Amino acid sequence: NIKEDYFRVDMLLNKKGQVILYGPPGTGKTWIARKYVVEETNEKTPGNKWEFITFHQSYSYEEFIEGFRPRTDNEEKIRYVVEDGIFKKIALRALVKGLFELEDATIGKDKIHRLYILLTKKEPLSPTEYEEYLRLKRYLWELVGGLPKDKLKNLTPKFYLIIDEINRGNISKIFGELITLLEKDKRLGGENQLIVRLPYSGEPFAVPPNLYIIGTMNTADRSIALLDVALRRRFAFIEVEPRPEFLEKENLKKIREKKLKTEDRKRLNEKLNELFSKLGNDNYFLKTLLEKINVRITVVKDRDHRIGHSYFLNVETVEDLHHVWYYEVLPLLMEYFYNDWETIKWVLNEKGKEHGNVFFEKLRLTGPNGEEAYQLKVLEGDAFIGALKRII
Amino acid sequence: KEDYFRVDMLLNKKGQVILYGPPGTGKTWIARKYVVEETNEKTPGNKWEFITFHQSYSYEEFIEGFRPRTDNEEKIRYVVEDGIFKKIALRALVKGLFELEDATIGKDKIHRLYILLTKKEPLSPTEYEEYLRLKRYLWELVGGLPKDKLKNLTPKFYLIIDEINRGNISKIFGELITLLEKDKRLGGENQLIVRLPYSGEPFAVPPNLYIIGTMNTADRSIALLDVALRRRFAFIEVEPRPEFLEKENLKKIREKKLKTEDRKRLNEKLNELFSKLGNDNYFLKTLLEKINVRITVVKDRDHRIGHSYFLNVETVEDLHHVWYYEVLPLLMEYFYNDWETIKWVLNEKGKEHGNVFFEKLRLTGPNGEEAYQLKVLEGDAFIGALKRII
Amino acid sequence: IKEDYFRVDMLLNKKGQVILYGPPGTGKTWIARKYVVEETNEKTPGNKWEFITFHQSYSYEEFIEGFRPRTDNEEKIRYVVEDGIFKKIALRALVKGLFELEDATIGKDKIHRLYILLTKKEPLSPTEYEEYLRLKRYLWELVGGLPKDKLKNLTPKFYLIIDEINRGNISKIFGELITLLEKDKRLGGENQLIVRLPYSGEPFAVPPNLYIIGTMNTADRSIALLDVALRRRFAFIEVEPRPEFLEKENLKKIREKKLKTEDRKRLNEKLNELFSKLGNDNYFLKTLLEKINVRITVVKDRDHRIGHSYFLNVETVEDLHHVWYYEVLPLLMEYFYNDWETIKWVLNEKGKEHGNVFFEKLRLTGPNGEEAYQLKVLEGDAFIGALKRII
Amino acid sequence: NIKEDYFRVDMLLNKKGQVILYGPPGTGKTWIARKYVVEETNEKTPGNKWEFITFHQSYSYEEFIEGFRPRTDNEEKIRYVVEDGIFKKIALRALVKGLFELEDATIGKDKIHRLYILLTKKEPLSPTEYEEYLRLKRYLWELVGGLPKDKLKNLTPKFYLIIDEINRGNISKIFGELITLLEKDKRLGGENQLIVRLPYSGEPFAVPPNLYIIGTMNTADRSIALLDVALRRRFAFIEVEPRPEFLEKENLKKIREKKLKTEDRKRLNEKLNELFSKLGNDNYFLKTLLEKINVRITVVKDRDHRIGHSYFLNVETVEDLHHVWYYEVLPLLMEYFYNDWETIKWVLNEKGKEHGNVFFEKLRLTGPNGEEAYQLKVLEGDAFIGALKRII
Ligand SMILES: Nc1nc2c(ncn2[C@@H]2O[C@H](COP(=O)(O)OP(=O)(O)OP(O)(O)=S)[C@@H](O)[C@H]2O)c(=O)[nH]1
Ligand SMILES: Nc1nc2c(ncn2[C@@H]2O[C@H](COP(=O)(O)OP(=O)(O)OP(O)(O)=S)[C@@H](O)[C@H]2O)c(=O)[nH]1
Ligand SMILES: Nc1nc2c(ncn2[C@@H]2O[C@H](COP(=O)(O)OP(=O)(O)OP(O)(O)=S)[C@@H](O)[C@H]2O)c(=O)[nH]1
Ligand SMILES: Nc1nc2c(ncn2[C@@H]2O[C@H](COP(=O)(O)OP(=O)(O)OP(O)(O)=S)[C@@H](O)[C@H]2O)c(=O)[nH]1
Ligand SMILES: [Mg+2]
Ligand SMILES: [Mg+2]
Ligand SMILES: [Mg+2]
């Protein structure tokens, strides 16, 4: 079921240019973003073919594209150079690797490979050869400004920039005058080829058409669809919904044995069968538990306030299902409905019951105005599975 | 092992725990006694560090930020100073790699990095520059280590963050909101090494760090509402247990942290307390439980009185000072100018005169309003106004 | 007399930090200033105690620690982190407590060198500031190697008496102090906390000497200490507006406390002339403040009550006239701005429209059948007959 | 002048320490604050004895007593120094001027004179003498700690700070430390001498008893009114009601010839005789006009929105009364009752009238849903006085 989402991402990548994997948390929309880039680019490490970037409110324009930094120059001669960020370094690296395998750009191809080594250099650049990095970049954009739009419609090395939590950072502060470049119509190779200068260093800049921005985005904090007006038109949105198909016994055995496929995977099978023998006789218990609680969430609050399938994905026994339920999702369900006991009971569909193996026992006290509030109860053993069985 | 059976079993499962609960409950105490009993350090420093969050606590002073540093006569060289978290994350990683020997060549070089991380003094520019080079050697070494030798490191470090809901929790964990997960630790199933903004260095959380948050969840509008924060942190509800306020439990608590000679004087003071309470050894338990039920049913379940208010009582006068100067201004702050509820929380809904904390003023308002006043009681008449709650 | 003095002294040993909350006009700052002066024998702030007061611009960077430019050389402005008002006290209260110890804290040359650089009023030169920053790193290497029995009992009691604690954004000003203000989370307690500061990175912990007696007003409900985690730390003393002081004898005992029998004979005949015009009753201003504070309790709240700082400084009936029409009746009108049938009831003149009423009725009416009253400045003995009807 | 509004300010400011002259606009509040201080200090301009500042919403706490203000030095342009505001430059000025006639400062009477020069110095403080200013400031608060309270009760100057429109600023934030100093027995020399510790400079500070603060708030607006109950105790509110008795025939000749003591007293008197002779020889016309509007505004609007007696004070002729009516107070009356036409017709006592000699003519065109609105009429001549005689 993972190749069906790779075909959906790859369809909306070559059509739009960049993608937002928006979904409720507990979905693998960072892992889908991380594994699709690793599968397509064939680079397991985040370096020289792709880069991982996390946004936040403290993230600024000076460290994302370029800003000013002091260096380790001479002692009484501390200098402020324009050290490039990550997005300028990844778009230059996609442009340098794109022109390295081009046929009509053979005027200085022995120098473009020199510029490629400087961009995959995994350290701060030395000041005796930073001007060699400056002169090779000035040689490059002179060459791309004197090339037609015929040979720049596509570049075969497809670079990526996995931006995680893209709605956390203020996207207008870090994309100053450069949010228009992300569209396919305004990239370096569209008909509206726009080589904008940068406000520092006087250097021109334009993103190549192979650099793809795969963003991951939570949409359960407050965002639904209208929070991101500066990126809602440039970015193609994909609903990565919580699939509870990954909680079947056949699927849970296959997922955990994908990485740990050594001899201890047999020890998982005698452990996983011990879990699905204590949940009755069925293999569809964790799937029906997630489905019959996600339906009861999307009927009350919202669709994207849904419980993901990453909480229950790491259970091996009834004790680990006890730890997931009482410490990660029911303290998450109580903060969805803060002090509203008529519907947090109904999400677990025990609305008739007031006690007797219920997660929320009713206090015997009433209210002056008529308020009645319940109380959390810790269960353990076969009583807890008897309280989980009544949800499905 | 009565409450570390939850805490120690959730750290190996998720990586970090937030002990959320109403105030007056042992959230900082459980989070401090668990870290001290495991790392064997009575004070912070080498194996753990205590911090807390506030509104003026920002991203630059937590993990990585810019900072001017003029030493004696030099110009203002703008150094990048690692915050609190990177001086724990690098310190857990370097002490982690110091015990094994698989491909970590340069054990004197790793030891040179560990000395330059526990410096009490600020780093000289002749020593900071070699510290920057050895930190780049560290991530080039970790990037060439297998996941089988990085999945286990014996010196379990601890970063305990009290009041974790105070600071801007998305602004603080900036490049850390998708790294704190157990799958994305430095040695998990998806080893993710992200690049930090200011210094440009790669940085990933080693699997030693257990971030023991203790969120206060009394007041709303500052609690963790964002569900991406509610997933990396496995919460623990620490309910205010009134079972620590019986006779045999309160005597066992305060004797545990006391000497031998004063334990007999402490036992005599607790016999004198419950002899003045009517030979009722279950009194302060049912006092806190039958006032936490009334706060749960009216206000909410997270504004309950904790068991740290009444835990430090030793006589009837010490209960009198707790009841009039620590929980009655607290009860008048919950239900401000709402008198028909605060009489019912103390179940004095029908009692308006006599042995009651709130007498009624004799005249009503011009349009049918009526207010009360906090009557100060003393002695056995106070207990007679307290034993009618239970 | 000594009851509020002893009640502060009891709660400052049990919880550690007391708060005197109450309606404005009672003895909150006064009983806090008289407590610290009578306990430390130091009438002006200095080493043993420091008075501060909070506001909205009293941020974290100048209370505990923050960056502050300071060079003391008219050149080479050194951007260094300087300790705020609190950390200059809590480090002072610690290194003053590390004098009387016998052999636990072996720093008798290095602690006294740190104390003389903490009480130094002249700002620190950089050749001695490097000594102050090095000795403070010795202090938190010293504290941590001491037993809790030789650290709980530090002798000299230091006080940071603060004022209007609710007025500042108290959860922001108290930074690392939000988890250290319990009696058992200090130094020497059962669970000591050497917590770490953000900016300087040097660790910090409050000594058991430092008590924070902080007075606040609770009539502004816009800014009241409703954080339920900063009401567990503090002990809240109720300071109600007590009208017992506004007798004839209790006003004569208070106002003739510091006069040395020179103007006391003038004050005695002046209070004899005041109460001879009120009706020869010694209990006038007691039940005047009582019948207003009760009538303002049942209407507005318990917390907007008139204090006893207004009527305490009256000498003749003219001075009561100038404290009625100019301090409390403008106060009573701004509780009830254009709410006229309520403010008429606080003076219980609700049936009285014209004559000797403070709010005479306008002879006009409204087009939609409305009406509004007009304040009437009364003088002479007719003012007292308009005031005695309140009782 | 000296009868009521002067002798009740001077008695109450000497007893409480601070006076707020609250009242509706158009009343002598700024004027009685300006006249009292100039007639007391004998200095018709600000500077040495008194300072006239005014509050606003852009006013800072950092610019009032103490704050970090970046100054412009020669070789280091961005130099952040702590600069005392206007209140700390009048409280320290009132202290070191009053400490010229004391007998315990016998070691540093030259140092107090040198500190008084640095506070009266209108030139900006150079950093070579700013440390001389800070060394003398911390010498001062060492000297008043050794001064007895019997000698700090009588400081022979009388310094004033007329703050105007006090209620406009954030008075709880501007008076940061001053919300616990501003009391008669909490200044220096009082029964409770309080020397609080300032945040920024770290130097202690205490308001001297030499100082007085005469605020003049405005109470027509309500969102800026002073409802701080802990701050209303510090001040002593004086209601200056808008008195129509300053608009009689004998009173206009006594108010306008007191100030203008030139030879135009024969010119003003024959013009004021001609103005009231056109009004029907009614010596109490403008007294009755302002009284029968302020009462009719009090009953429907608030009591603090009344027309002051500063509009009709500067009238000279019927042409000047026509200018002050249709352009100052009639657009003011259309602001109080904005499209509430049945009220504003009633305030001018034209409720039944809808045509003829009237200010607001009725439109002969009703609306769709039964609504109807009126229209102004610019009157002139004796018909205007016939529209004013209906009010009284
Ligand atoms: N094999 C496999 N693992 C999955 C799948 N979906 C989720 N997971 C696992 O669950 C974990 C959570 O997925 P992840 O992508 O990290 O959530 P997230 O997008 O970061 O969540 P958030 O940041 O928006 S709050 C991952 O570590 C991954 O291993 C899946 O479809 N197949
Ligand atoms: N022995 C023992 N003491 C406890 C227990 N719970 C609380 N206490 C005591 O109560 C005191 C206060 O508890 P504490 O942990 O500090 O509350 P808190 O969580 O920090 O409260 P807040 O910061 O959210 S407001 C501690 O000093 C501790 O000694 C307990 O379970 N056992
Ligand atoms: N002798 C004596 N004087 C008192 C008493 N209560 C109040 N006063 C006097 O009243 C005056 C004002 O009291 P004060 O403490 O300043 O009010 P406050 O609570 O501080 O006012 P606030 O704005 O901060 S809320 C003081 O000068 C004090 O002398 C008392 O009980 N005894
Ligand atoms: N001679 C004299 N002039 C007066 C008197 N009352 C008001 N005035 C005049 O009114 C004019 C302005 O009044 P003023 O005091 O400035 O209003 P204001 O307090 O500033 O009004 P506001 O906008 O702040 S709310 C002055 O020119 C003054 O001459 C008075 O009683 N006697
Ligand atoms: Mg993610
Ligand atoms: Mg805590
Ligand atoms: Mg005060």
Ligand SMILES: [Mg+2]
């Ligand atoms: Mg004015």
